Design an enzyme around this catalytic site. Structure first.
Site, PDB file in Angstrom:
ATOM      1  N   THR A  18      -0.357   0.250   4.520  1.00 49.21           N
ATOM      2  CA  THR A  18      -1.562   1.148   4.631  1.00 49.21           C
ATOM      3  C   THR A  18      -2.517   1.171   3.436  1.00 49.21           C
ATOM      4  OG1 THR A  18      -0.462   2.702   6.298  1.00 49.21           O
ATOM      5  CG2 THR A  18      -2.260   3.570   5.066  1.00 49.21           C
TER       6      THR A  18
ATOM      7  N   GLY B  10       0.860  -1.276   0.157  1.00 49.07           N
ATOM      8  CA  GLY B  10       0.089   0.010   0.100  1.00 49.07           C
ATOM      9  C   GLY B  10       0.847   1.288   0.012  1.00 49.07           C
ATOM     10  N   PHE B  11       0.447   2.202   0.802  1.00 46.43           N
ATOM     11  CA  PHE B  11       1.083   3.537   0.996  1.00 46.43           C
ATOM     12  C   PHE B  11       2.286   3.525   1.739  1.00 46.43           C
ATOM     13  CE2 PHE B  11       0.507   8.231   2.624  1.00 46.43           C
ATOM     14  CZ  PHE B  11       1.483   8.667   1.495  1.00 46.43           C
ATOM     15  N   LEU B  12       3.621   3.820   1.347  1.00 48.26           N
ATOM     16  CA  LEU B  12       4.626   3.672   2.034  1.00 48.26           C
ATOM     17  C   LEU B  12       4.891   2.782   3.093  1.00 48.26           C
ATOM     18  CD1 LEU B  12       4.909   7.586   2.534  1.00 48.26           C
ATOM     19  CD2 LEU B  12       6.375   6.272   1.093  1.00 48.26           C
TER      20      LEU B  12
END
Ligand code: HEC
Ligand code: NA
Lengths: 125, 382, 105, 147
Positions: free
Chosen positions: B93, B74-76
């Site tokens: 995330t 996902g995100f970072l």
């Protein structure tokens, strides 16, 4: 242009990575996705907290404190990417660290990164 | 699109086999492959994709220079790899509507061979610290049963995730310190704003035991965000913006500060040489050697790529070699086996260059690694 | 519940009533770390430096939710009127190391 | 000669209220004449200066002037700008500010005020170059305070 050479600011094009107010920008210039130099694009959420940097203005020879607030709640714009680190310190000195996603305070708890604005919040040293 | 010499050889060998199989009367029967067993030469490359909402991790056989698998994130996300090669995992995330809506922070554990998720642990109240990927902001305890992650706001804290029981345990309140370096099943160190190191001893219940070491560096000496840490050797290698290296020995269970050494020669520092990049430092345990990304650059261009790597003896500080990489390199790491490979990742070329860690010679390369690859992770299986 | 917000947005420090209970923010710190006030009092924070700051009380301190005050630029103020007796801790959102405390008696 | 005014209403300070004891010292005389406090960083008076601060100021301003129920006094920021100078600092103590920070002439002699002031200056945590109340020689030997 050598990326390792001393950064030289200009005051004639805000969409270029060497525009003086972007001395510590990390990400993308909001003006390239519908925002402006100091405003977020439509649909995104404006963060209240951010890292700062003292940037030298070649026009008046003064140094101003820039608050790099991110516009959030959108996938990264992908337009006008830039990464400058004038005076940027490690993460344990967060007030000046720019790898951090400065989206805190944005409406709806938006925390995804879209772009960054470069507003002046005061005179520096 | 563009083939490297390595993938060109693989492509040809595969065509040779397909043609021969066809002529010999063999039939094609599609199935799902399993990746080869994890070994010292397997290397992982993570692509934060310039802060994109979704990311990718590439699993590479460093020996052949071939992508043997991938993992979506996902995100970072923060990647971790068990040193014994028994599993890989990441703290990630996601959002209900791509980059907005309901946020879900979670930890996924994967089978190292089938690459299938074997665990999906949700983290309460989205506690992950969203920042450019720092390997040591999410760590595994040496026994591989616990995962620790950092929370920045509203207050410094470290989350405890039981990988064995597949469940989130609790958040640990800590002082204003950053990074997580586990030394035991119930102990880890952090670096604090005051310049000291904090030792945190926790358990299943109760407030944690926190003790500070002496301050080991002044306010004006900046320690980079990407120190190298060898859990098996209990060696923390921390460079500063100028290339001075602080080494901490945690093998006894308590911090022991070794003499600082300059990674750059007197002449290089006078000529404007300074380290620069993302993962700027690497440490080989068995050889007890340090590798540092350096180049001539202005003092505030510390995140730009570098074209040289200097190697020094970690015990004496002796300069062993200086390699001309021949490419714009952002991150480096090394395999932990006898004759190590030197991994050089170029964010700009989205290419992983593989060199002989001894001669510095480029052996092979793997391109098309995402949009903005930045992190290299290897396992110390020795 | 335990405090009311006289103003949702920060205002010019020049508007700060003379003789008001003030906590100055400067040099990365709340100059008066342990302010003692009586129930009903209105506390006012004034940022004295270029570096933006705010006051932030985590959830369960002033109410069920947290109170993330607005960021104050140099010479800007923000107020809070405490209605309940007790000790209230706070910090600056982007600068977690900056801590303050308000004791209501 | 320095101008000694009440930092709040700008009225002239009345030294006729000062205690008779401690107005004769070389330090006081030099101060009233030049506005310079010779006790700053004076190793011979610091021990006592610390004791004076401890009993009279630490309760409100903190053990190290870092601030507590009262404002900190160890950095470059001053609610009353003139306090960056010793004439201003003195005026604040003598004539008082607002609230519980009232005049000290009834409890401290002129000499004691100067000694107390010296300790406050000693607790400065800012950059020596920014200590305009110190002479060049004093700046050379000054080191920001640390507990
Ligand atoms: C509590 C009863 C106090 C004692 C004892 C002392 N001080 Fe104080 N001081 C107090 C307050 C509540 C304030 C703020 C006043 C205002 O008008 O805002 C102060 C202020 C000062 C200052 C001014 C600081 C500035 O930022 O300009 C100074 C220089 C100062 N106080 C000094 C001082 C000394 C040396 C004391 C011991 C003799 C002392 N104070 C005692 C409250 C209290
Ligand atoms: Na102050």
């Amino acid at each position: 242009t050598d990326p390792r050479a001393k950064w030289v600011p200009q005051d004639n094009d805000i969409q270029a990575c060497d525009y003086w107010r972007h001395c510590s920008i990390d990400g993308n210039i909001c003006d390239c996705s519908g925002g402006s130099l100091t405003n977020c694009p439509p649909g995104t959420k404006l963060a209240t907290a951010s890292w700062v940097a003292s940037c030298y203005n070649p026009t008046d020879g003064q140094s101003y404190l820039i608050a790099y607030r991110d516009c959030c709640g959108y996938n990264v714009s992908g337009r006008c990417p830039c990464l400058n680190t004038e005076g940027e310190l490690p993460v344990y000195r967060p007030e000046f660290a720019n790898d951090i996603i400065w989206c805190f305070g944005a409406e709806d708890d938006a925390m995804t990164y879209h772009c960054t604005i470069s507003p002046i919040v005061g005179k520096a040293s | 699109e563009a083939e490297t010499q390595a993938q060109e050889t693989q492509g040809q060998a595969a065509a040779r086999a397909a043609a021969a199989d066809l002529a010999a009367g063999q039939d094609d029967e599609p199935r799902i492959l399993e990746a080869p067993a994890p070994d010292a030469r397997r290397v992982y490359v993570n692509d934060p994709a310039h802060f994109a909402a979704v990311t990718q991790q590439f699993v590479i056989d460093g020996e052949a220079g071939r992508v043997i698998g991938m993992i979506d994130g996902g995100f970072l996300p923060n990647p971790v790899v068990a040193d014994d090669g028994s599993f890989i995992a990441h703290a990630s995330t996601v959002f209900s509507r791509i980059a907005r809506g309901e946020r879900t922070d979670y930890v996924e554990v994967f089978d190292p061979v089938t690459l299938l998720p074997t665990a999906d642990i949700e983290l309460p109240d989205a506690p992950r610290f969203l920042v450019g990927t720092y390997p040591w902001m999410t760590s595994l305890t040496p026994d591989g049963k616990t995962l620790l992650f950092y929370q920045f706001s509203p207050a410094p804290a470290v989350g405890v995730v039981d990988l064995e029981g597949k469940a989130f345990k609790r958040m640990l309140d800590v002082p204003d310190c950053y990074h997580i370096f586990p030394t035991a099943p119930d102990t880890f160190f952090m670096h604090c704003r005051d310049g000291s190191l904090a030792k945190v001893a926790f358990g299943t219940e109760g407030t944690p035991e926190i003790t500070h070491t002496e301050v080991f560096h002044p306010e004006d000496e900046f320690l980079i965000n990407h120190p190298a840490y060898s859990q098996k050797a209990g060696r923390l290698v921390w460079p500063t913006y100028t290339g001075k290296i602080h080494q901490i020995d945690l093998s006894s269970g308590d911090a022991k500060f070794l003499p600082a050494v300059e990674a750059l020669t007197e002449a290089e520092r006078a000529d404007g040489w300074r380290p620069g990049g993302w993962q700027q430092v690497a440490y080989h345990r068995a050889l007890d050697r340090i590798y540092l990304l350096v180049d001539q650059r202005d003092e505030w261009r510390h995140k730009t790529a570098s074209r040289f790597v200097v190697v020094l003896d970690a015990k004496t500080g002796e300069r062993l070699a200086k390699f001309e990489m021949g490419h714009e390199i952002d991150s480096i790491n090394v395999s932990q086996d006898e004759k190590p490979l030197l991994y050089a990742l170029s964010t700009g070329d989205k290419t992983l260059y593989i060199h002989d860690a001894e001669s510095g010679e480029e052996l092979r390369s793997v391109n098309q690694l995402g949009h903005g690859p930045q992190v290299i992770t290897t396992a110390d299986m020795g | 519940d335990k405090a009311t917000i006289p103003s949702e947005s920060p205002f010019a420090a020049a508007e700060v009533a003379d003789g008001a209970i003030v906590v100055d923010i400067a040099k990365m710190k709340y100059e008066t770390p342990e302010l003692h006030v009586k129930v009903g009092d209105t506390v006012t924070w004034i940022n004295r430096e270029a570096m933006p700051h705010n006051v932030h009380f985590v959830a369960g301190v002033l109410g069920e939710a947290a109170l993330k005050g607005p960021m104050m630029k140099k010479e800007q103020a923000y107020s809070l009127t405490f209605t309940e007796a007790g000790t209230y801790d706070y910090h600056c959102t982007p600068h977690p190391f900056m801590r303050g405390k308000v004791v209501v008696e | 000669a320095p101008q000694f005014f009440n930092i709040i209403d700008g009225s002239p300070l009345n030294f006729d209220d000062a205690m008779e004891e401690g107005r004769d010292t070389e330090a006081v005389k030099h101060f009233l004449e030049t506005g310079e406090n010779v006790y700053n960083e004076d190793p011979e008076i610091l021990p006592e200066a610390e004791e004076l601060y401890a009993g009279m100021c630490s309760g409100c301003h903190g053990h190290y002037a870092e601030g507590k129920i009262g404002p900190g006094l160890n950095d470059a920021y001053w609610t009353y700008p003139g306090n960056e100078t010793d004439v201003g600092l003195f005026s604040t103590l003598y004539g008082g500010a607002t609230g519980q920070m009232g005049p000290m002439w009834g409890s401290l002699t002129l000499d004691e005020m100067l000694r107390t002031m010296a300790w406050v200056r000693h607790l400065y945590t800012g950059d020596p170059k920014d200590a305009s109340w110190l002479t060049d020689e004093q700046k050379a030997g000054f080191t920001p305070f640390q507990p």
